[PDB]
């Protein structure tokens, strides 16, 4: 017997105390070591209700990652507005620090447990007959990125399509893949080329197959009609209108117009997306802008696999005949929800 309630959770991590990397330092001075003997107890004849879009663990992880990015990244200039409109300015040294997200487990204190749904077809909200109880969720890398989801978990069998309300075109949609799509972002080293110019290479065959699977799952969810064009983001900051992420402390903003041309009414080069290194960024913590330091020397390499993405529907399918989606993101609460969808905190009764 238990009840649906929230509490002040803590964090566990395998952070190295000798590692100067900022995620390790944060998880060392703010989290305990991981559970040396973790266990997952299945619940017999228990059908529990879950709702990822109304989960407090998402907000807890969001606040923890905000604190991590505030204590870790030291930009050269900080600007925080408030809107008569006037702002402020914070100035401090901006050294180059190592950046690489590490898995972070979220554990519940005494008297509380974490219910995890084991349904391979669990779409996000609703009942679940295969429930288990744990104390700490599995390791989740806090990869702060827009549009694309990197270094996350995969769907079990079919591609998962989740949304707080697919009927509302304002609420965003998240797509969790069943197979990952490799992506190799590189900023080469000698004086040739721009200092901020980089490129992400991705195999077009696997991306084509996964995009076909994604539009097929869109059809299975609703429509079966014409998923039209698949364009890019319509207006907004450079953080939402392009794939914005971080690699080794450098902020990469990559052009995603190459992977967005799905003229599918029904149904050996690679895709090379250009990228720029922006120091003057708009922080995802809604606290204004931040200017950092020039990139380091040598080559900047990041090889990951896309495991999911986020889109936004333009409700044109009601009166027309086609279906428009555009790349979204920004609110990293959706990024944390893409991994905290099957977990919920419960109070033991």
């Amino acid at each position: 017997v238990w009840k649906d309630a929230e509490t002040t959770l803590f964090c566990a991590s395998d952070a190295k105390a000798y590692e100067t990397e900022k995620h390790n330092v944060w998880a060392t001075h703010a989290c305990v070591p991981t559970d040396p003997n973790p266990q997952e107890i299945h619940l017999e004849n228990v059908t529990e209700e879950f709702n990822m879009w109304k989960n407090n663990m998402v907000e807890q992880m969001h606040t923890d990652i905000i604190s991590l990015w505030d204590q870790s990244l030291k930009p050269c200039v900080k600007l925080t507005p408030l809107c008569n409109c006037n702002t402020s300015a914070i100035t401090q040294a901006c050294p180059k620090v190592s950046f690489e997200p590490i898995p972070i487990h979220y554990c519940a204190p005494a008297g509380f447990a974490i219910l995890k749904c084991k349904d391979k077809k669990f779409n996000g909200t609703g009942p679940c007959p295969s429930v288990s109880t744990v104390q700490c969720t599995h390791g989740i890398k806090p990869v702060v990125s827009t549009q694309l989801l990197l270094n996350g978990s995969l769907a079990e069998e079919e591609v998962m399509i989740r949304s707080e309300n697919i009927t509302n075109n304002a609420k965003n949609i998240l797509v969790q893949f069943n197979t990952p799509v490799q992506i190799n972002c590189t900023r080469p080293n000698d004086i040739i080329g721009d200092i901020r110019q980089a490129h992400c290479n991705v195999s077009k065959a696997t991306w084509n197959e996964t995009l076909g699977k994604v539009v097929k799952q869109l059809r299975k969810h609703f429509g079966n009609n014409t998923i039209i064009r698949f364009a890019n983001s319509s207006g907004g900051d450079l953080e939402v209108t392009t794939h914005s992420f971080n690699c080794g402390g450098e902020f990469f903003y990559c052009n995603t117009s190459g992977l967005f041309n799905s003229t599918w009414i029904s149904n050996n080069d690679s895709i090379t997306l250009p990228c720029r290194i922006k120091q003057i960024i708009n922080m995802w913590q809604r606290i204004g802008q931040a200017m950092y330091a020039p990139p380091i020397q040598g080559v900047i390499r990041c090889v990951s696999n896309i495991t999911g993405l986020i889109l936004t529907r333009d409700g044109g399918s009601t009166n027309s005949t086609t279906e428009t989606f555009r790349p979204g993101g920004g609110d990293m609460r959706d990024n944390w929800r893409s991994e905290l969808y099957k977990y919920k905190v419960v109070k033991i009764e």
Partner: antibody, heavy 128, light 110 residues
Framework: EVQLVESGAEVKKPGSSVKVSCKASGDTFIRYSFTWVRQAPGQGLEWMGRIITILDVAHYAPHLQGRVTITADKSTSTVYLELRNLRSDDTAVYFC?????????????????????WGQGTLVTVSS | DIVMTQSPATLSVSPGERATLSCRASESVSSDLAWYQQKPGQAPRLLIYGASTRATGVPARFSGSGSGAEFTLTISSLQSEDFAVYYCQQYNNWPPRYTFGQGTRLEIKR
């Protein structure tokens, strides 16, 4: 490249303030940072401060922090230096200077500290 | 406060010969070091930045070297227009508190 043209010579009594201007023409204003440097007669160059034009953020030399203000008017491509509570020892030629920082409008910013382009200088005399 | 010291105060060199000017920093400034030329009644002119990179329009006879806290400007063959005052400038610190050397006057030795 950018051409920097400063305002005319000033004569001030001790205790007054002065505001000198510098028009930048020929390139994208917001892609440059601007710096003010002064030189008392017979002496050397002294760094006073630097504004990051794209960000509207200025930094000042410790000795005068509190009585110096550097601003930029993006609509007229003009940089301003204000010096308050003038002292006789503030008599100097004031140079406006700038440097290209990169594609600032695309978040590229070298934060260069050297000074490629220089104005003709403005004599500011502070005396009773 | 990083203090920049130039030597010598005055350098007298016969026309057409080599000139070597020294700049020292009170602490390491890596390679964030620039050299400027100033003639009487004129604004300074950027010659070198990044310790060793010549600015546009600067003849090849000007060359910068050094790192850390010690830098050198060499002019391989002094032309009539090279006689002027030369300043070094440090821009390594952040928050910025940039400082200049006190100058070396390069005059004509006759």
């Amino acid at each position: 490249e950018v051409q920097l043209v400063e305002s005319g010579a000033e004569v001030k009594k001790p205790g007054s303030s002065v505001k000198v201007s510098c028009k930048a023409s020929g390139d994208t204003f917001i892609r440059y940072s601007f710096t003010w440097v002064r030189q008392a007669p017979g002496q050397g160059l002294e760094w006073m401060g630097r504004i990051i034009t794209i960000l509207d953020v200025a930094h000042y030399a410790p000795h005068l922090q509190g009585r110096v203000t550097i601003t930029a008017d993006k609509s007229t491509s003009t940089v301003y230096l204000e010096l308050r509570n003038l002292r006789s020892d503030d008599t100097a030629v004031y140079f406006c200077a700038g440097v290209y920082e990169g594609e600032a409008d695309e978040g590229e910013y070298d934060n260069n500290g050297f000074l490629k382009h220089w104005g003709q200088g403005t004599l500011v005399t502070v005396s009773s | 406060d990083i203090v920049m010291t130039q030597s010598p105060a005055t350098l007298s060199v016969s026309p057409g010969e080599r000139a070597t000017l020294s700049c020292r920093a009170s602490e390491s400034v890596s390679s964030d070091l620039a050299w400027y030329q100033q003639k009487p009644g004129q604004a300074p002119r950027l010659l070198i930045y990044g310790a060793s990179t010549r600015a546009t329009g600067v003849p090849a006879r000007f060359s910068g070297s050094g790192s850390g806290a010690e830098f050198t400007l060499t002019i391989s063959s002094l032309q009539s227009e090279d006689f002027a005052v030369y300043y070094c400038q440090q821009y390594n610190n952040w928050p910025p508190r940039y400082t200049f050397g006190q100058g070396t006057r390069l005059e004509i030795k006759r």
